[PDB]
Request: fold
Amino acid sequence: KDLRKKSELQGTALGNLKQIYYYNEKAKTENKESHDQFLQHTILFKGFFTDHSWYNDLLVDFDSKDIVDKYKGKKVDLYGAYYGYQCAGGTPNKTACMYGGVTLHDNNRLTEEKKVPINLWLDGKQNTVPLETVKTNKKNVTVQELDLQARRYLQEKYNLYNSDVFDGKVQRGLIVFHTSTEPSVNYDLFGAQGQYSNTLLRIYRDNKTINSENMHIDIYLYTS
Ligand SMILES: [Zn+2]
Reply:
């Protein structure tokens, strides 16, 4: 297809993708509230981390002040991948970074959690994915929240982000967040830019959320 290939992805790019989607901790937290803005289109959550870990503040970046004004001062829920490297922001080695992942709290919580159906095809051979693979308690959920889970599995079941010598067989792939309404969102499993989280995680900057009810995912893998 018109998919980018593993070959082109630097050894650190492929490594960081693997840390992001497999090795790293996601930032999940409910009923959070922030008034703090930081330079035109980012919200700053003072003391996002309540444990005793490296990072204290979190800096959520978005495409525009439109999205920022949609959440600033509102009770939001977070779910995403955060990074410390090149986290261009305020408090020194204390501010971590995330792109979007912000959701509106109220009325979003579902009665019973939704298991999002993934259809998989490795070289046409439709392989089946477990039903608990990707799940969310949100009526309206970020593509990032679904993505982080969807890709975790492809890392596990398929070593997607492995060097060709350690079974990184698939060399091209596409993930599709097919929704029951608007045009499905599609990602190229290898089309990220850069080799570090600062640019790789930028794809989610649009804070694109979708309807979880009556929706699923399509994953196409090609080992050629
Ligand atoms: Zn579909």
